[PDB]
Design a protein around this ligand. Structure first.
Ligand SMILES: Nc1nc2c(ncn2[C@@H]2O[C@H](COP(=O)(O)OP(=O)(O)OP(=O)(O)O)[C@@H](O)[C@H]2O)c(=O)[nH]1
Ligand SMILES: Nc1nc2c(ncn2[C@@H]2O[C@H](COP(=O)(O)OP(=O)(O)OP(=O)(O)O)[C@@H](O)[C@H]2O)c(=O)[nH]1
Ligand SMILES: Nc1nc2c(ncn2[C@@H]2O[C@H](COP(=O)(O)OP(=O)(O)OP(=O)(O)O)[C@@H](O)[C@H]2O)c(=O)[nH]1
Ligand SMILES: Nc1ncnc2c1ncn2[C@@H]1O[C@H](COP(=O)(O)OP(=O)(O)OP(=O)(O)O)[C@@H](O)[C@H]1O
Ligand SMILES: Nc1ncnc2c1ncn2[C@@H]1O[C@H](COP(=O)(O)OP(=O)(O)OP(=O)(O)O)[C@@H](O)[C@H]1O
Ligand SMILES: Nc1ncnc2c1ncn2[C@@H]1O[C@H](COP(=O)(O)OP(=O)(O)OP(=O)(O)O)[C@@H](O)[C@H]1O
Ligand SMILES: Nc1ccn([C@@H]2O[C@H](COP(=O)(O)OP(=O)(O)OP(=O)(O)O)[C@@H](O)[C@H]2O)c(=O)n1
Ligand SMILES: Nc1ccn([C@@H]2O[C@H](COP(=O)(O)OP(=O)(O)OP(=O)(O)O)[C@@H](O)[C@H]2O)c(=O)n1
Ligand SMILES: Nc1ccn([C@@H]2O[C@H](COP(=O)(O)OP(=O)(O)OP(=O)(O)O)[C@@H](O)[C@H]2O)c(=O)n1
Ligand SMILES: Nc1ccn([C@@H]2O[C@H](COP(=O)(O)OP(=O)(O)OP(=O)(O)O)[C@@H](O)[C@H]2O)c(=O)n1
Ligand SMILES: [Cl-]
Ligand SMILES: [Cl-]
Ligand SMILES: [Cl-]
Ligand SMILES: [Mg+2]
Ligand SMILES: [Mg+2]
Ligand SMILES: [Mg+2]
Ligand SMILES: [Mg+2]
Ligand SMILES: [Mg+2]
Ligand SMILES: [Mg+2]
Ligand SMILES: [Mg+2]
Lengths: 247, 62, 247, 247
């Protein structure tokens, strides 16, 4: 046989490159996944991740209460935290024993898989009683925030998209939903009558994952990296795997 | 349902809830947790899916 | 001096081989130990080991209750488990909040040291109220189960004997005692009048060991291997050390 | 065929009677069980049963502490009960908050299977520090109490033997061991040299059972009756099954 790495007959090299290219391209087909992650960062350095993976479109919707830190199997000041919520829903509405709950997120990062179309991304960032813009009567139910997403890149390839915003002020008390649509450069509308019931089934088939990691390092090591997920850390370093035309 | 949601939960009884957080960490990534057991008895041993007879079987997706 | 490994004057090699042979043969003398282990395997992957080591003869006897899983320093549903025992002693006799106690053993392995005589092994596998065979009136107090023991082998040598049985069914609710006698190819009966009081003293001198390990791996690493004990794991792999005529 | 119940050719009737006779006689053979029960009765109406079943001989030995009532999975005043024991071991030796512990047995019943030889029964009824008769120096280690055992009878047959004694006084604070030997009308001594190692193995093979029932009714219904055990209740009623020459 030809010697490795010296000719066009290195079929192991050609198949390795095809194996990667096919994964990249499958994810972008209408048969592929589109995925979103919301990361809520807490002052103790822990991170709640919520992930949803589905065909055609995907999103996540959470209340103010649901994004607060919850330590499984530990004390959580649960009575005082009921009172904190009352005081956040209406000023002076509660009887809490603290000025600032350390369970409130200090920051949110939203990441989409590279199979999203960025122009379809929509976010409803509401106040603590789940209203998008001060009063229901004057609320558009979302903002199209695609222009703010940064490309997470590895070896020159877009491995995902990130929108990050800090919540450093006492008044940053939010509810949050986000949504994006899978790329579709074709003129076959996946929600047109021929396929609309498949998209209804996709609403039931979407898989969700939720967990609190103790540190960004642990999130990088045990969540992002093992699953070949995109990520951007506090030092602006990009994680992910480049696949298109690569061995 | 998530992996976590299908685990056994005994309402109003002890559920080893701290150890079970650690079991989940060890299931999400090998050697990722610090649990005090090899196998969680809260993990399902089996799943049965049943549909009503009004389903069309060719549309079922899992 | 002669060079190592090249002549009959490698006295270090001769002494190494004698050191091993003497241990093998001492254990088989009437001055040596005979040992039994009972392993009760639980559905959480943990393993109760009971070991007894004595001269002349050895055994272990346990109730249904004693073989149930007990987690030292943790919750054990101890009130519900009293009710589980009532329901196991007589059908519908208890008021438990579960159909199957996960503390019930899923399997038993009995292992004897290679100094046992296999034809002397006896087992009383009783029901949950400690009766060998349905009713006392019709019970022979034991079954001689030696024919069922497998040889645990390493490098061609018998390092011990194993009888394993699963308890996979709801009705497998047992009490258990086992017993074996140290080899004695001589015509000197160790229980004849000259030595019988020594065997009575051996009943008092027998050393017992009991502990729950969290996994078969941990049992292999920290119990079986450090002490040069025989074992057979779920994958049918044999552990032990061959000693006869070996360096 | 002949009609049932009218001739010597009712082979189903003959086999039924043989089936019962064989159980009766097997239990009395040297291959059969001999069994002892100790029942400790508490003032709350509950009953601790300890049972031992073995070939050749059988007994039970318990400390003062071990015979005290223990409610599995409930409060047991365990600190105060340590102090009660100190005050029972030596007058004014403890710092308990009660004059009389309700965990002390009010009565003991010892029952043997009908395969015991009554003349071999021995009892060591000690004081609370486990001394048979006031001081060790003057103690015979047992009393042969067979003459006091009553025959428990059903349909004319001895189904077992009972010795009962109340402990109604404040000073009735006891430790207790009992022992009996299986019948052997032969001149083959089961402990002579030919078989002595089998009797040593029987010491390891003896099966034990222990449990606290909440009432004598529950003991009758769920312990005595289902297992065809002999018993004598507080009303002097005999329980058991007659088997010899019976359908
Ligand atoms: N492309 C490129 N890579 C370099 C150069 N110097 C060092 N590198 C390293 O080499 C790696 C890329 O190597 P290759 O994948 O073999 O080169 P390629 O440009 O992808 O070409 P093909 O894989 O043959 O299509 C990068 O990760 C760089 O860190 C350079 O001049 N050009
Ligand atoms: N006996 C034997 N062992 C082999 C052979 N080939 C590889 N081995 C390995 O060598 C090991 C045994 O080596 P030795 O103990 O030196 O050979 P031996 O047969 O015991 O002979 P002595 O120790 O000199 O009595 C085994 O564990 C084998 O895995 C072979 O042909 N014969
Ligand atoms: N033996 C006997 N039993 C009676 C009499 N009257 C009523 N019985 C009842 O009948 C039962 C015994 O019946 P059987 O077992 O048929 O009589 P048996 O004397 O044992 O005779 P075989 O069984 O034929 O050997 C007892 O439980 C009594 O309650 C009587 O006069 N004699
Ligand atoms: N020394 C080099 N000269 C020319 N091209 C290079 C060199 N090193 C890498 N490249 C190529 O340039 C492209 C971009 O790779 P690069 O590693 O710069 O991007 P990245 O990992 O997305 O971002 P960065 O490394 O800047 O964080 C890839 O195709 C890569 O192989
Ligand atoms: N390649 C070989 N050819 C001949 N004899 C061998 C070879 N390898 C090992 N032996 C010898 O054969 C005997 C049996 O050793 P072996 O390792 O097969 O037994 P074991 O460890 O009890 O079982 P196994 O390895 O099959 O689980 C030993 O004396 C050993 O030294
Ligand atoms: N009416 C009767 N006349 C004659 N013999 C009887 C009668 N009833 C029973 N028997 C027989 O007398 C024997 C003794 O039975 P019985 O029921 O009197 O003894 P038990 O059950 O040990 O004691 P008890 O019934 O007095 O508590 C048995 O063989 C039985 O069949
Ligand atoms: N504003 C508050 C906060 C707490 N408490 C009281 O202090 C007790 C403990 O507080 P909690 O907030 O429930 O904290 P933990 O019990 O420590 O935590 P958890 O409930 O999560 O286990 C409560 O039962 C409640 O009586 C209160 O009166 N008023
Ligand atoms: N891997 C583990 C498991 C438990 N624990 C400790 O043991 C205590 C009790 O364990 P937990 O798993 O919370 O069980 P329970 O309290 O019995 O059950 P529950 O929490 O469901 O009421 C915990 O607070 C925790 O301190 C631990 O340190 N490490
Ligand atoms: N069949 C049952 C089981 C439990 N319980 C009640 O629930 C309480 C807790 O149950 P238990 O079985 O004792 O479990 P734990 O307290 O969790 O474990 P442990 O006792 O081993 O520490 C008990 O006090 C008892 O009141 C009950 O009424 N009936
Ligand atoms: N003579 C006694 C008896 C009890 N106590 C105290 O009261 C507490 C409770 O008593 P205890 O006898 O242990 O009863 P419970 O806790 O009710 O029962 P258990 O321990 O069996 O669960 C103990 O920790 C001990 O401090 C004491 O000081 N002196
Ligand atoms: Cl497509
Ligand atoms: Cl010897
Ligand atoms: Cl016989
Ligand atoms: Mg807990
Ligand atoms: Mg609380
Ligand atoms: Mg780079
Ligand atoms: Mg081998
Ligand atoms: Mg409890
Ligand atoms: Mg206490
Ligand atoms: Mg009668």
């Amino acid at each position: 046989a030809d010697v490795a790495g010296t000719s066009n007959r290195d079929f192991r090299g050609r198949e390795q490159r095809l194996f990667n290219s096919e994964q990249y391209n499958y994810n972008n087909s209408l048969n592929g996944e589109v995925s979103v992650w919301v990361y809520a960062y807490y002052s103790d350095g822990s991170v709640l991740v919520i992930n949803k993976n589905s065909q055609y479109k995907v999103g996540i919707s959470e209340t103010f209460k649901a994004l607060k830190e919850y330590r499984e199997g530990q004390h959580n000041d649960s009575y005082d935290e009921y009172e904190v919520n009352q005081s956040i829903y209406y000023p002076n509405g509660g009887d809490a024993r603290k000025f600032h709950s350390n369970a409130k997120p200090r920051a949110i990062q939203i990441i989409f898989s590279p199979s999203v179309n960025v122009r379809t991304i929509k976010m409803a960032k509401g106040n603590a009683v789940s209203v998008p813009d001060e009063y229901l009567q004057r609320s558009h139910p979302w903002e199209a925030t695609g222009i703010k997403y940064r490309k997470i890149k590895r070896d020159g390839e877009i491995v995902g998209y990130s929108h990050y915003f800090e919540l450093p002020h006492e008044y940053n008390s939010i509810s949050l939903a986000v949504s994006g649509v899978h790329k579709n450069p074709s003129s076959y509308n996946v929600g047109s009558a021929h396929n609309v019931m498949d998209v209804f089934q996709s609403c039931d088939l979407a898989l969700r994952f939720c967990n609190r990691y103790w540190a960004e390092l642990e999130l990088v090591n045990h969540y992002i990296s093992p699953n070949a997920y995109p990520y951007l850390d506090i030092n602006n370093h990009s994680y992910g795997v480049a696949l298109s035309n690569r061995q």
